[PDB]
Amino acid sequence: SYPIFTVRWVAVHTLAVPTIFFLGAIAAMQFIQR
Amino acid sequence: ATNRDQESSGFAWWAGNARLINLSGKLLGAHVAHAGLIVFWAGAMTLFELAHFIPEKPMYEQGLILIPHIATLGWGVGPGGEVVDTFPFFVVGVVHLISSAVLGFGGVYHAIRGPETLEEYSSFFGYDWKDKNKMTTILGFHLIVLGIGALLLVAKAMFFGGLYDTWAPGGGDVRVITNPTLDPRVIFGYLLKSPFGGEGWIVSVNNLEDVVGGHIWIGLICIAGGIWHILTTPFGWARRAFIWSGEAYLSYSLGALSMMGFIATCFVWFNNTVYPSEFYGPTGPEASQAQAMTFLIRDQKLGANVGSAQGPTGLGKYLMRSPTGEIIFGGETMRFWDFRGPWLEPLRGPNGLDLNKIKNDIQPWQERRAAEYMTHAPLGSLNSVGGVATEINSVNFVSPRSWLATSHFVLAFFFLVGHLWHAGRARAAAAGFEKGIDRESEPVLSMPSLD
Amino acid sequence: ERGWFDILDDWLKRDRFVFVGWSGILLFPCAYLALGGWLTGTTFVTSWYTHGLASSYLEGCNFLTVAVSTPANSMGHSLLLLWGPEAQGDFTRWCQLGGLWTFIALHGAFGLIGFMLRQFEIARLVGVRPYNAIAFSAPIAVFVSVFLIYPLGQSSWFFAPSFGVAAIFRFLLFFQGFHNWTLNPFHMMGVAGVLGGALLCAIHGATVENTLFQDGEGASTFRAFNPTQAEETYSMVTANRFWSQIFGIAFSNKRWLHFFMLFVPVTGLWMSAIGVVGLALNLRSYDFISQEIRAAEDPEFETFYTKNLLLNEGIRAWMAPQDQPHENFVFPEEVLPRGNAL
Amino acid sequence: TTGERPFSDIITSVRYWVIHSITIPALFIAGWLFVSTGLAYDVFGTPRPDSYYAQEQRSIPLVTDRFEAKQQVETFLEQLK
Amino acid sequence: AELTPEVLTVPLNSEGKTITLTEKQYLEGKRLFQYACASCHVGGITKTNPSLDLRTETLALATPPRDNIEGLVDYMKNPTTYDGEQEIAEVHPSLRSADIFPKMRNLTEKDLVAIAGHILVEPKILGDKWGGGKVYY
Amino acid sequence: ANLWERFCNWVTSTDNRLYVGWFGVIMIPTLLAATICFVIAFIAAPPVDIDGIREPVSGSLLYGNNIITGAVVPSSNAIGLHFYPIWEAASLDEWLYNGGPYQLIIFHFLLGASCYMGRQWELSYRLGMRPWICVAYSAPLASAFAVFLIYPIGQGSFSDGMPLGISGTFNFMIVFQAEHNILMHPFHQLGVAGVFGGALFCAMHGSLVTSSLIRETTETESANYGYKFGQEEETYNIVAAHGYFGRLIFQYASFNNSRSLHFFLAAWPVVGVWFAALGISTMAFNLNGFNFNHSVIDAKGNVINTWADIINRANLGMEVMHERNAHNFPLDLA
Ligand code: CLA
Ligand code: CLA
Ligand code: CLA
Ligand code: CLA
Ligand code: CLA
Ligand code: HEC
Ligand SMILES: CC1=C(/C=C/C(C)=C/C=C/C(C)=C/C=C/C=C(C)/C=C/C=C(C)/C=C/C2=C(C)CCCC2(C)C)C(C)(C)CCC1
Ligand SMILES: CC1=C(/C=C/C(C)=C/C=C/C(C)=C/C=C/C=C(C)/C=C/C=C(C)/C=C/C2=C(C)CCCC2(C)C)C(C)(C)CCC1
Ligand SMILES: CC1=C(/C=C/C(C)=C/C=C/C(C)=C/C=C/C=C(C)/C=C/C=C(C)/C=C/C2=C(C)CCCC2(C)C)C(C)(C)CCC1
Ligand SMILES: [Cl-]
């Protein structure tokens, strides 16, 4: 009934895809020791 | 699902607990379940404090707020406030934790299993908010309970080991209170003191005899009034002054709690008798006076005549006169000359600080105590870096007096907002316009214009 | 004529979950890049070579202390294009030299233009008057005056605000110490507009909510409103009588009331922007000459004005060596201004 | 409504979660590895804890020229032994 | 820059013998210094008497010299005034006065060495910041 | 109709041009007293020894101040938190030297303004209104208590209360930053969100309602004449406003219920200013902003400065210079 790939789909993923990658990068930083 | 949606009850989910107003049985459960939460926290937090407690560190260096309450009552501590036995702290924690399961059990039962309303089930436990006789009777029972509670503190002080007395000769110790103050001129004279500097209203109580005798008076008063309110019903003048409804009664209590929270804020901030500095750290006034004492001692040891040292402003560098003549510490701490503490009073004469005692009678334990309190002033950051806002990281410290005073100001403030919210709503609901203005009966349309 | 331009126009203006429009060709890349640059920079990029500061989660900063910092003072007002003569196409050097700051500020400027074109574009399609776009001129005037004009009057981008929480706090304190910005009547007007705007926001909302008509039976009054109803949902007449008798004066025209709510904060922000334009040239309201002449000659004359200048003097001397490392200030202990004891 | 499938429809559909139970952790782990391999340091030019200063120096490697700024940073980076 | 054995090498006594601490000793010294000393000595100053700091140059001119491990360990057992003339255990924390300074009751000899080591290494790291006060914050 | 019932009916009458009411019976005399003392003191009061060090600060117009530098100066640090009414002074000249007027103004003002809040409740009850306008006023009122009463209590002196003047306010703010790092306190940050947000939503609501006014006038007249006081029908199209703002963002980020929209307008600034007031009130007991001074350390142990450390440098400059003759000992503990 509904399409899958719309403008809203692109807008959602340009934000959500880097967010998750950044959250993993920042999670790893909590174990860096000087 | 009796009254468990917005259509049946009229209250949306975010005001869902308002659906309980006329469901005394579920309302009983909510109250009992919640008291279990209070008793749970008391039990659990004590155990957490105990597990994290090192007896060689001062309590106030360890983030403790509950163990200091227990130690003040005389359990676990000896001379100087040194911890001699942590088992009482353990007992207090365990018993509160175990009791919360009993309360949680009853709360959950009444909330979801028992009768939703109690009026059909029992007329003794049933009540109607508008029944002025039943409401004052329930009030009377709880006054008798509170009165017994105040008498338990007297029993501990007079018969079961006593209380920790920061003022006791020889550095502070547990002491049995044998002659509590009963003179009503003393006890009620505290109530008529100004709340301003040098007076301090009831926050100024500074000896355990007054503390204990005040609780004797409070115990009798609560028991008597409790019997009074069981046997009587509100008088005609009282009937006309109040709103008689559940929300109204809530709003009055919210006002009362807000007032008590503000008083407790000032108590922990200024009083060092029922909040001994050995357990809670110095007061703000105390640490500021202690700095002046520390440098007076240092400089006098180097050969300064501190009585005659003129500071840059022309006022004494170490000592000056208060606006009424008393000899007091100089510098910015001139504002704190109302401070009284056991480490300072041996230097006090009839005219205030006595220069001969300062020159000759300062004992090493006083220098120790002043350096300790000066370096544990109640200043520190939200992430618990101790000291002035410009200090570097190193010292993990925020005084218990700051934690207890800030938390209870915030709570008291919101409880005042709650009083205004619910008192204003109670009034509007009683009169019938808490849902808005009737279009066909808009009161302003029947009033003469202003101009 | 239904050429490709008109077909493109059709697709851009489709009623979808996120409207696009012609303005969206400018708005969306520039907004996304400015936001992505700030998140990239605050997560991974240092300020060590431009400021002597750590400024990223990677280095151990937290949400309050991360920033994308301004470039080094030696860059002047360089555009700092990735392909320009400073970075020379080297992405890593570009980051180390402060290229992300101009990247964010410039894409942000064009993003803001794009947002305001979007307000015009949508307003014209729906058929409303474009007052929302007009009100948005005030955030744009602030952004352009603080982030672009102010550093362009100064020696370099370095003295622009850096993009971070604590870095902005440093910017507030720099403006007190060096510009005496609290004394500036253009700032004062901006304060009045912001605080008066918040005041109007609170009072209008509370007044509506407490003069509601009973249009339903539930104790939650929110349900008793229908977006297409013709009637006012609250009593303007009762509201007017309440404030007339509480305060002396009240609104009586609802169109004036809501124009005024537009007017007050928008005007305030515009006033503050003019003052910052003056600070670009150091054209400060720093002193009252009459106060200084008296205080120079009369060492017993003291006001809160002279007290605050002493604080500004402390700020300048104690923060300048670290805050301006390219100047190489060496201030021996003996020259630092300090009161007694502290 | 504007025609796209409702969000509540999508995020309660098994197929959404079949796909995203993989794509979400995969991205998280890529981000973690970007830091844990040390790649982030070298892409952006950010100092490691042991490379802010040389062992005995206490001066910042501050950039002071506009058009030789690139060489200045490279020179500062050499001097880390 | 790194915390190297060179940094961690400090005078053991006045005769010029050195001792090299481990990183674990240094970090233990830091934690114990914070536990027992920093309330008055944060950053190498002395809040209750700012005339005396913990700079090595100041410790060198104490009597007896305190710019080495043995001198500092002795100070924490039996502290004296700067000229050595008087014993100040009654007002300064020490092993001799662990009854009245209870935090000293659970310090062992090994701990005193680690605290001492922290005090001698920190100036090699921080330079003027150590003992310099707010001017160098 | 006895004389007490007559007086009560006049006091509570909804026909007075300005409502009096029982709160107004306390409000009117206390606000008059504070206002008259303030005006006289601002024009003509002699210098006041705010910090107790016999170093009087000039606050009034006749003693060399303009509108921007003038103030009613807080009472002396030597008084601390003692009550200092006129009758505790040996003379008016003593009372003026020691900052007597400050105490009289703020005590009467705080009483009057609390009664102003009660009066807002009281009139809503007489007119058949809902009662919570006074809850919104509690936010600015709590703030006045914070800087005039609570902060003096915690610091132990009314000499650290906010001065009653424009430059005096700035002095208070700067010293507050030095002593509590208020910028780094989340309650001040929530307060900034409250008033930045409140100003934003103010301009938002004003612009959207204005954008959707229903054409009722010609171009040569003010559109404000298109609304008539007391008219039954709404004057703008909220559906058109929602249709615009929903497309500006997305549909579900926009209000179409005027009641919940106006509730949001009330709540956002009021809640934010409550936090601001609680920030001042809890920093009165020295629970200060986040301290990240020297939080970032390199492998060797060198301090790596952050923007937080640059803020600390500015705070230090404020600290060492404020009240330059008032400190004899190294720590400014209150
Ligand atoms: C202390 C906090 C507290 C307490 C004691 C209550 C209590 C109650 N709420 Mg309220 N409520 C609260 C907070 C609280 N609420 C909050 C924060 C909100 C906003 C979300 C609400 C919103 C709300 C609404 C909208 C409604 C209520 C209702 C009720 C009543 C019936 C609930 C029910 O039937 O659920 C049934 C739920 C279950 C059977 C699921 C599990 C519930 C049990 C009790 C969990 C207990 C777990 C515990 C660990 C077990 C310990 C056992 C051990 C002691 C032996 C009950 C008296 C209802 C009411 O008024 O009825 C007339 C109702 O409609 N509440
Ligand atoms: C003993 C105290 C007490 C009691 C028994 C009540 C009881 C009631 N209140 Mg009142 N109220 C109180 C104090 C109290 N209030 C205080 C102190 C305030 C000021 C804030 C209010 C302000 C208030 C308002 C504005 C309203 C009520 C309403 C009500 C009714 C519905 C409540 C409900 O279901 O909430 C449901 C509970 C929730 C929705 C949860 C709220 C979540 C809070 C905000 C989180 C707080 C953060 C937490 C402390 C820390 C963070 C936690 C996080 C990190 C996880 C109920 C009769 C409603 C009413 O008028 O009905 C007649 C209503 O509109 N109350
Ligand atoms: C009277 C309340 C009170 C007070 C004064 C203290 C005080 C303390 N606690 Mg305790 N504690 C409490 C309640 C309290 N706690 C409660 C309710 C719990 C269960 C959650 C705990 C569980 C607990 C643990 C597990 C620990 C402490 C610790 C401590 C110490 C350090 C505190 C800290 O670093 O905070 C950090 C500061 C914050 C987290 C700020 C909180 C901000 C809140 C969310 C704002 C809420 C505002 C308001 C309520 C909401 C209004 C909303 C509006 C819309 C109406 C300090 C002595 C520590 C310690 O040293 O133990 C020995 C520790 O480890 N506490
Ligand atoms: C203030 C709290 C409170 C109140 C007013 C009530 C009231 C009621 N309960 Mg509930 N209940 C409670 C708490 C409460 N309960 C708790 C804590 C539990 C778990 C133990 C229960 C578990 C419970 C069950 C399983 C049942 C009830 C029932 C009832 C109803 C009949 C009770 C009766 O006639 O006993 C007669 C009076 C006594 C037997 C005297 C008991 C004396 C106690 C046990 C000794 C301690 C007294 C002393 C004051 C305690 C101090 C506690 C304090 C330190 C906290 C009545 C409405 C019954 C019901 O709902 O019927 C449908 C029922 O079946 N309750
Ligand atoms: C929880 C405690 C509590 C509560 C809620 C009540 C509630 C009530 N009492 Mg009861 N009472 C109590 C405890 C309580 N009482 C105790 C312990 C005793 C024994 C001492 C009494 C003895 C008693 C008597 C003799 C009477 C009541 C009456 C009443 C009713 C009228 C209350 C009223 O008008 O107060 C309003 C308060 C006043 C009118 C006091 C004067 C107003 C002053 C100026 C306010 C001062 C405020 C100021 C801020 C004070 C600060 C502290 C101050 C001490 C310095 C009300 C139902 C009346 C009644 O109807 O009996 C059936 C009544 O005649 N009570
Ligand atoms: C405050 C209650 C203190 C605590 C806790 C610690 N020290 Fe201290 N220290 C303090 C003072 C007032 C002085 C001067 C004593 C004098 O009159 O000479 C000192 C001195 C020292 C020194 C000598 C420094 C010098 O330059 O000679 C040292 C080495 C020292 N203190 C070490 C030290 C240690 C290791 C501590 C924790 C176990 C410690 N101090 C705590 C005040 C206080
Ligand atoms: C109603 C309701 C509600 C509420 C509820 C509640 C609130 C409840 C409570 C509950 C509770 C309140 C509970 C409790 C419980 C408890 C318990 C269960 C305990 C146990 C204990 C133990 C087991 C112990 C142990 C130990 C010991 C003995 C020793 C030491 C160690 C230890 C700790 C291990 C809600 C909101 C959800 C909603 C719905 C409705
Ligand atoms: C314990 C103690 C003590 C004692 C105490 C006491 C003895 C107390 C008492 C107390 C009291 C005894 C209190 C009281 C209170 C009261 C109140 C708080 C009141 C209120 C009122 C009101 C609120 C009213 C209102 C109104 C009006 C006014 C009008 C009409 C209407 C109405 C009713 C609303 C001492 C200190 C010695 C010491 C320590 C301990
Ligand atoms: C720069 C640049 C660029 C770009 C980039 C980008 C575009 C990026 C993006 C990025 C991104 C896009 C990122 C993101 C991130 C995110 C994050 C990191 C988030 C986080 C979050 C959080 C953390 C949350 C929190 C919270 C809050 C806030 C509130 C609510 C609650 C909670 C707690 C949840 C390019 C290549 C073009 C070129 C070169 C330069
Ligand atoms: Cl001082």
Author numbering:
A (entry chain F): 12 to 45
B (entry chain C): 23 to 473
C (entry chain D): 11 to 352
D (entry chain E): 4 to 84
E (entry chain V): 1 to 137
F (entry chain A): 11 to 344
Question: What is written in the article reporting this PDB entry?
Answer:
The diminishing difference densities around QA and the non-haem iron at Δt1 = 1 µs to Δt1 = 200 µs suggest that the attraction between the non-haem iron and QA− is decreased and that the electron on QA− is transferred to the non-haem iron. In addition, a strong negative difference density appears on W7, suggesting that W7 is disordered during this period. At Δt1 = 1 µs, difference densities on Mn1–Mn3 and Ca vanish, whereas that on Mn4 continues. The results suggest that Mn4(III) of the OEC donates one electron to YZ• at Δt1 = 1 µs to Δt1 = 200 µs. As YZ and D1-Q165 move to a greater extent at Δt1 = 200 ns and Δt1 = 1 μs, the positive electron density on W22 increases and spreads to cover W21 and W22.
Photosystem II (PSII) produces dioxygen by extracting electrons and protons from water, which takes place at the oxygen-evolving complex (OEC), an oxo-bridged Mn4CaO5 cluster with a shape that resembles a distorted chair. Here we use pump-probe serial femtosecond crystallography to reveal the structural dynamics of PSII from nanoseconds to milliseconds after illumination with one flash (1F) or two flashes (2F).
